[PDB]
């Protein structure tokens, strides 16, 4: 359950998801799960995808998480009128732009990573694709 | 518990470069020293910059720290 | 460093003279050959300079770096300023205490016609 | 002052020959010595500073100055402003005289003396040591004092490294035990 520790502020503005991804290149391992859609991943979703891959590879190779939530998200309690201040924080989400690399794999057969990433992609709300480590 | 605020103090630059000013005119309103007074410019106790002579206000950079200065040219 | 400390000490006066835009008499003191110069407000030009290095000033001083040497150079710069026409000048300690040679130079100029 | 004459006469030649330098003045010189003791019990008993300074003044040739805490530390319940120790600095000829009164008639009278440490070196040309009792100093004779308080001696040199720093110490025939 990835979460920042002792964050500067409990709440933050919603902001916008405009722009373009920055970490668009595979730099740690050999295979990556690029995201071509736009959206945000919750900590619960990230955990679910990670569990799917580590088990699909059956404790083999290395896995790197290239995304962190680092953004509190609030929800008003049920049957609460508007106003009366900002709502409490319930879950943390990460902002993902097209081209951002989410998960990255190494030390596994090329094929095995494909199903492993495919299983992980099945548990995310955004379009994703399979990319390989390019030589510069 | 939030909701408190302070009324705006309307700081900033009042006269911009190349603009003729009269003696005693306020050129910059600032808290610290965004700009340092040069020739014919005085610095008040509030760090306000005022012109000590009639002329055109000019901006430039001097000093080892590349600080920004304001001066008046009598032209 | 000894040198770095002096400039830091004398920086406040130098800036104050610069913004006042007045001719300044700057004095450099060392174990030998005390120096004196007069700098115009612009700062890029020097009107008159005096010191003990000149053979024309050291042919009668027994030693350089003494009150007599300080007074002699003080008189030399004083009369040079008078003949040059400049009258009003502001003394500069240049980070030196106004106690000994610097003081001995200042009063010599003051009594020689360079009041300040 | 005898040692300064001793230092200026031949040991300079010995250092010159030993270190085959291109000039004599590269040889290191002693510039000052400093005495110190961080008593720290000033809060518990404020009026101990007077005797703390008095004894050091007797040991040294001049008056000490009482230092102040550089910061605030909760571990020792002290804050900047409250004196916690005093020190002296010796340089010139007084330092030369003090050194002889140290080497001559101080080290031999060390209670249960075993040997002076040699690993005590900063790494740049400064030597530090400590003492347990003031008896090594003739100014104390068990009659006007009742405290086991100690102090520290730090000697600083113009040396550039340990190799020449130790060589200078060897020239001055330290116990080196």
């Amino acid at each position: 359950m990835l979460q920042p520790k002792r964050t500067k502020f409990r709440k933050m503005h919603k902001g916008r998801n405009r722009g373009l991804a920055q970490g668009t290149d595979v730099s740690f391992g050999s295979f990556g799960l690029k995201a071509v859609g736009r959206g945000r991943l919750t900590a619960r979703q990230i955990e679910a995808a990670r569990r799917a891959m580590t088990r699909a590879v059956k404790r083999q190779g290395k896995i790197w998480i290239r995304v962190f939530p680092d953004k509190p998200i609030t929800e008003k309690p049920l049957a609460v009128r508007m106003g009366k201040g900002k709502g409490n924080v319930e879950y943390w989400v990460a902002l993902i732009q097209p081209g951002k690399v989410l998960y990255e794999m190494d030390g596994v057969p090329e094929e095995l990573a494909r199903e492993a990433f495919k299983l992980a992609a099945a548990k995310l709300p955004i379009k994703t694709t399979f990319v390989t480590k390019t030589v510069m | 518990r939030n909701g408190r605020d302070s009324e705006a103090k309307r700081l900033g630059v009042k006269r911009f470069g190349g603009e003729s000013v009269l003696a005693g005119s306020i050129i910059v309103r600032q808290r610290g020293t965004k700009f340092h007074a040069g020739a014919n410019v005085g610095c008040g106790r509030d760090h306000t910059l005022f012109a000590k002579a009639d002329g055109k206000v000019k901006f430039e950079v001097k000093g080892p720290k590349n600080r920004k200065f304001i001066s008046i040219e009598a032209e | 460093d000894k040198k770095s400390a002096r400039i830091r000490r004398a920086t406040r006066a130098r800036r104050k003279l610069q913004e006042l835009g007045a001719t300044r008499l700057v004095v450099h003191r060392t174990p030998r050959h005390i120096y004196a110069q007069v700098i115009a407000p612009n700062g890029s030009e020097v009107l008159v300079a005096a010191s003990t290095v000149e053979k024309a000033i050291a042919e009668q001083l027994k030693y350089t770096g003494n009150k007599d040497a300080a007074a002699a150079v003080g008189k030399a710069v004083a009369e040079r300023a008078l003949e040059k026409g400049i009258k009003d000048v502001s003394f500069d300690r240049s980070g030196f205490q106004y106690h000994g040679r610097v003081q001995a130079l200042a009063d010599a100029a003051r009594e020689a016609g360079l009041q300040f | 002052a005898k040692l300064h004459d001793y230092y200026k006469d031949e040991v300079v030649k010995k250092l010159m020959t030993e270190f085959n330098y291109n000039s004599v003045m590269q040889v290191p010189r002693v510039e000052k010595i400093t005495l110190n003791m961080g008593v720290g019990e000033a809060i518990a008993d404020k009026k101990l500073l007077d005797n703390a300074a008095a004894d050091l003044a007797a040991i040294s040739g001049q008056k000490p100055l009482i230092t102040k805490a550089r910061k605030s530390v909760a571990g020792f319940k002290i804050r900047q402003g409250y004196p916690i120790g005093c020190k002296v600095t010796l340089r010139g000829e007084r330092m030369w005289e003090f050194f002889e009164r140290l080497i001559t008639i101080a080290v031999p009278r060390i209670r249960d003396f075993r040997g002076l440490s040699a690993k005590s070196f900063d790494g740049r040309g400064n030597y530090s040591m400590g003492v347990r009792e003031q008896i090594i100093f003739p100014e104390i004779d068990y009659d006007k004092v009742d405290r086991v308080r100690g102090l520290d001696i730090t000697i600083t040199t113009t040396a550039k490294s340990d190799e020449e720093g130790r060589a200078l110490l060897a020239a001055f025939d330290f116990p080196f035990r």
């Binding site: - | - | - | 005289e97 031999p108 003739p138 116990p175």
Partner: protein
């Protein structure tokens, strides 16, 4: 060199048992009784 603030620094001669006699400046007092010195010691 400040005056009227430092203790006495008068020169005094001291001798030890092994026969070495020297002279030092300090506020030790009037006379000195020594047994060992830098030399003539079981070092």
């Amino acid at each position: 060199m400040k005056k009227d603030i430092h203790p006495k620094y008068e020169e005094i001669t001291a001798s030890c048992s092994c026969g070495n006699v020297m002279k030092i400046r300090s506020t030790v007092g009037h006379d000195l009784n020594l047994d060992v010195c830098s030399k003539c010691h079981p070092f």
